[PDB]
Every structure is written in C-alpha cells, then in structure tokens.
Design a protein around this nucleic acid. Structure first.
Ligand SMILES: Nc1ccn([C@@H]2O[C@H](COP(=O)(O)OP(=O)(O)OP(=O)(O)O)[C@@H](O)[C@H]2O)c(=O)n1
Ligand SMILES: OC[C@H]1O[C@@](CO)(O[C@H]2O[C@H](CO)[C@@H](O)[C@H](O)[C@H]2O)[C@@H](O)[C@@H]1O
Length: 578
DNA sequence: CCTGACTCC
DNA sequence: TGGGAGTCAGG
C-alpha cells in the first residue's frame, strides 16, 4: 500500500472529505501524546508527524472546519487528546467504532482491524500486533508506525459505505448519525471539562477512616479470637465455617461464600458478621473513593477526568473509568459524604442534579402496554405502594414501609427476570410466599406477563431484540436446549429492551439539552451522566432557569404512552444537590 | 492474571 | 436460581 511520508502539509491533504487518524496509544488519552497522524482522501494517503501538522496553521484550520468531513475510529479519543493541546476537531461525519458497536455490541470491537473483520477487510493489522501488550507495549519505528496508521485510515475510508449500508438496512443509520455521533462530542466536552474535587476534605476523611478501620479491625479479631486477613474471603471462610462452625449456606466454584447476602443471613448465629460487613464497606470507601480517587486527581487543577466508554455495554448504556464516577456512594450516609468532595469548578457556581423517576418501570409500562401499569403512571400513583397492595392484598392504608420495600424488590426484580428463589433470597422471606408475590404481580399486570412471553418469542424468531430508537442485541443462546444458558438469554431478551430504551432516552436528552444551553448562551454545562440522571454545574444565577429547562428537556426527549417524570435539586456540592 | 468483595443505576 | 457496569485486595 503506497503512501507519502510527508514532511510538510500540502493543500491536497486538506480535501473536504478524508479518513483521519490521530493516534493516541496510551489507553487513557487525557493529556496523552499524539504519536502520529494519517490522512487518506481522493488525492492519496499521507503520514504526518504531529510536531509538524499540529503546528501548521492550515492543517489546524482544516481540523476545526466543520464543512471538511472526516471519517474516523474513536473520534472522541482524538478530540479529547487534541483539546488537551488546544486544538478543536470538527466535521466528524462517520465514526467506525460507534458504527461497529451499533451493528453488534457483542463483538467487542475496540480497534480498526476488529471492525474491518466484520466486512472481511484484512489489509490492516490489529493494534495489539503493532504496539504489543502489557509491559511490552511500545511505539514502533517510524516506517512501521506510518504504515499502520495509513492502513487504518485506508480501512476507515473503504469501510464507511459498507457499514452505513448495513446500518441503514437495520434502521440504525439515524441512531448513529443523529444520536451516537453527536453524543460523542458532548461526552468529549464533559470528559475534558472534568469535575473539581475538594482534596483536603477527602484527605481528612481518609485520615479519620484509617482510625476507624483500625478500631473495627481489632474488634473483629477480638470477636474471632484470632487475627486474620478480613479482606481475604478465603481466610474469612475458614474463620466463619471452620473455627466458628457457622452453617454453610452457599459455596462458589472456589469454596465457601462470604457474600453480603450470606453474612446477613448468619446474623442470628454470631454478631461478628455485622462487624465484618461494616469493615468491608469501610475498607472499600478507603481504598477506592479516597485513595483511588486521590491517585487520579490532577494536582494543579484538582480535577478528575473520567472517560465514558460509549462502545462497551451490551444494552447501550455508557460506562465510566479511571475513575468510575457512576458508582459514587449514596445509600449509606457515611459513604454518601464522599459526594461533599465533588464541587463546582468556579467560584459562586453550583451543582445541579436531575434524575428520571423510575424510568425502567415507565418504559416497561410503555412497551408491555399494560393498562394497569400505564394507568398507575398516567395518574402518578406510587407504583411500589400499588404493587404492595396487590402482592399483599391490602388497602393502601395497611401497607407498611417494609411491605413497600418488598414490593419494590418485586417491581425491579420482575424487570431483571428474578425467580421465586432469588426473590426469597434477596428479601430473606419464605420461598412459598415469594412465589405468591410473583404470581400475584403477573395476575395484576397481565400485560407484563404477555410482554415477557412475546419478547422471548420474538428473540427466538429474529435472533435479536431491539430498543425504542432501534438499538439491537443479538441473543444466539435463546434457543439453546440447555436450561441455564437459555434461561440467561431469556432474561436478557426481557430486560434489554427496557434498559436499552432507557439508555436511548437519556442520550437523546443530553443532545437536546446541550442544544438548549447553547441556544440560550448559558454557562451551565454537563459534567456527568449516571444512567438515569444528569449532573451539571452553572453560575448560581442560572439555577432558576435550569430548574425549568433541564426537567422539561429530559421529560420531553421522547414521547411514551406514559409520562416521564424528572426530579431535580441543586447545591454547593454534589452531596447537597439533594 | 482471576475471583469475590464493594459500589452505582 | 435478577439486568447492566468498574475497582480493589488477595491469591
Ligand atoms: N430491590 C431492588 C431495589 C432497587 N434496585 C435497583 O437500584 C436502582 C435504584 O433503585 P431506587 O432508587 O430505589 O428506585 P426508586 O423506584 O426510585 O425507589 P424510591 O421510590 O423509594 O425512591 C434501580 O434502578 C435498580 O437497578 C434493585 O436492583 N433491586
Ligand atoms: O477511547 C475509548 C475507546 O477506546 C477503547 C479501545 O478502542 O477502550 C480503550 O480505552 C478505554 C478508556 O481508557 C480503556 O478502558 C480500555 O481498556 C481500552 O481498551 C474502546 O473500548 C473505547 O470505547
């Protein structure tokens, strides 16, 4: 494959359509080096040294010109790496990573060669083959690097039309061009902005937490009558089931289980299990949300810059890494205080948080077209209280707080394909009763039962299920003769349209919201998405406007057979936005 | 490296 | 024997 290893940018490199590679080899692309650039267009194939091209005013103009269209793979990686150099990338019209992901998330496409494999294109090597793995990873010599980047650009160039044609075939071209590609740009902005962190506060928390871990630890050794590694399920298992001879409720492939559920169930036998559960909660706060977080905060700006993986989950959700900012504690007050350390990036700005209320159950109502469930939402009746009345067969007055929490377990459990066994184990109740709860649920919401049956039938017939905005998931195990393998696929068939349609909706909301913020020239901007909620920061002056704009945009992103409902709060820290 | 903890939706 | 994720310590 012929290409020019160029020493300067020329006009023919700047055509109004091109495949572009802006190579960042570090997995975490924030403030990462760009090791090489390739361009393929109608006029030829070119390799450019970053030091050259990125200092060349014409090439920089071209990159930032939205009418000069680029086809790329993982344009967010390039856009963010470029942002860290103060260079704007616009005009990305095709992203091969996002296209491959929409066509089949199960393939786990993470490099151009893997995408190319989908169309039997083989004139390009896998990245791991060129760079090496683990401790062996290195940028090769220029001629080897140059050929690799050009081959990746040539592949994107040849593969664009084939991928667009299949997407169009699948009714997924708009999903790519109108949803995922614009979202990619919004996520790039979010990641690059980062979130500001009050490190003094975390370090203090860590100091205090270290004291308490030592206290709990020593008390556990007292109760056990022995020292051991409490963070070793293997050692813990010997203490519990051999030394203290507590009952063995469950084994894993490797040995005795010490899961939270098992330890909870052992509480009537020995008090130490409650101490141990507490110790492990504290240890995770320390290791992950104090120490782990502080490791990744940029010391001069005190910001953390997550990476949202847009092409990973099997249902269309994002994930968040290094650090994961989608699993910051909230359920326990001690852990929830971590959120006091997430603060606005400017003086006199505030954090604004908006969350969909029960979006999965509303989506289930919509998709199952169950009159009873639809009506409950149409009238905004508390769905957990409703399900309690049905599964316990009582009037609204007689529903105790605990009955509501059990009904809640049923409501989400049904959405996740739970069995009477799992429900009984989760609520620690009789399995006979758990079975009754489920039978009563289905008797009360017959449309949901028909949905579960129908969607499993559809998956068997088509080989995949689909979401509201035409995302798909293939389920080749759905007709397996093996009960376990088939059962798992059946649960995926039932859950994916629900979870994935919810993901579709919040993504569209993010796009609609950014349009409105820019439309109104507000300084407010998105910081995070946490599956069913959006977190922003803005000047304190803008709260009044956001209180109106943010929920309206989120609620109206799509129109279902039931309303969508959005709650929202704001305050001086993420913790206080409640 | 994998497993089994913890955390979130 | 409930869906979708990431990180950490221990082994
Ligand atoms: N028994 C339960 C309860 C909750 N969840 C989950 O944890 C998430 C958050 O649940 P939650 O906040 O409690 O939902 P709400 O309906 O809003 O509860 P509530 O009305 O009391 O505020 C859910 O999306 C679901 O993934 C679950 O898996 N099993
Ligand atoms: O850049 C995000 C994009 O890159 C991929 C590889 O193509 O994932 C890589 O980067 C992730 C973010 O740092 C890492 O978590 C990872 O392990 C690495 O392979 C895609 O999966 C992702 O969408």
């Amino acid at each position: 494959m012929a290409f020019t290893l160029a020493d300067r940018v020329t006009e023919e490199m700047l055509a109004d359509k091109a495949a572009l590679v802006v190579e960042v080899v570090e997995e975490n692309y924030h403030d990462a080096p760009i090791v090489g650039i390739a361009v393929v267009n109608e006029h030829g194939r070119f390799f450019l040294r970053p030091e050259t091209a990125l200092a060349d005013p014409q090439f920089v103009a071209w990159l930032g010109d939205e009418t000069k269209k680029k086809s790329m793979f993982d344009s967010k990686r390039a856009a963010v790496a470029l942002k860290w150099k103060g260079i704007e990338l616009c005009g990305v019209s095709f992203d091969l990573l996002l296209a491959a992901y929409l066509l089949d998330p199960a393939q786990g496409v993470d490099d151009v060669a893997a995408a190319a494999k989908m169309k039997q294109y083989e004139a390009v090597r896998p990245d791991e083959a060129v760079y090496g793995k683990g401790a062996k990873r290195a940028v090769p010599d220029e001629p080897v690097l140059a050929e690799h980047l050009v081959r990746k650009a040539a592949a994107i160039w040849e593969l664009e039309r084939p991928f667009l044609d299949e997407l169009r075939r699948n009714e997924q071209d708009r999903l790519l061009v109108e949803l995922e590609q614009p979202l990619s740009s919004i996520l790039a902005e979010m990641e690059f902005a980062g979130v500001k962190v009050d490190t003094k506060r975390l370090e203090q928390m860590g100091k205090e937490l270290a004291e308490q871990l030592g206290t709990v630890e020593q008390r556990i050794y007292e109760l056990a009558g022995q020292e051991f590694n409490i963070n070793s399920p293997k050692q813990l298992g010997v203490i519990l089931f051999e030394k203290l001879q507590l009952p063995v409720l469950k084994k894993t492939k490797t040995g005795y289980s010490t899961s939270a559920d098992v330890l909870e169930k052992l509480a009537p036998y020995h008090e130490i299990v409650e101490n141990i559960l507490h110790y492990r909660q504290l240890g995770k706060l320390q290791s992950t949300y104090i120490e782990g977080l502080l490791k990744v905060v940029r010391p001069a700006t005190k910001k953390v810059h997550t990476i949202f993986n847009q092409a990973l989950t099997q249902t269309g959700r994002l994930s968040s890494t290094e650090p994961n900012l989608q699993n910051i504690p909230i359920r326990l007050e001690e852990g929830r205080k971590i959120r006091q350390a997430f603060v606005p990036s400017e003086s006199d700005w505030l954090i604004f948080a908006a969350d969909y209320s029960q979006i999965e159950l509303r989506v289930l109502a919509h998709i199952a077209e169950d009159d009873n469930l639809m009506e409950a939402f149409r009238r905004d009746l508390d769905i957990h209280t409703k399900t309690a009345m049905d599964i316990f067969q009582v009037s609204e007055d007689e529903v105790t707080p605990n009955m509501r929490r059990q009904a809640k377990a049923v409501n989400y459990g049904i959405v996740y394909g739970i069995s009477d066994y799992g429900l009984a184990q989760n609520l620690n109740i009789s399995r006979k009763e758990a079975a009754e709860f489920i039978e009563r649920y289905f008797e009360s919401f017959p449309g949901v039962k028909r949905y579960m049956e129908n969607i499993v039938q559809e998956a068997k017939q088509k080989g995949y299920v689909t979401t509201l905005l035409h995302r798909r998931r293939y389920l080749p195990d759905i007709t397996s003769r093996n009960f376990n393998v088939r059962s798992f696929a059946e649960r995926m068939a039932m859950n994916t349209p629900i979870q994935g349609s919810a993901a579709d909706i919040i993504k569209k909301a993010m796009i609609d919201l950014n349009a409105r913020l820019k439309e109104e020239r507000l300084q407010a901007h998105l910081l995070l998405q946490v599956h069913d909620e959006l977190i922003l920061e803005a000047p304190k002056e803008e709260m009044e406007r956001l209180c109106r704009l943010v929920p309206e945009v989120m609620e109206q992103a799509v129109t279902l057979r039931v309303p969508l409902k959005v709650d929202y709060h704001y305050g001086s820290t993420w913790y206080d936005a409640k």
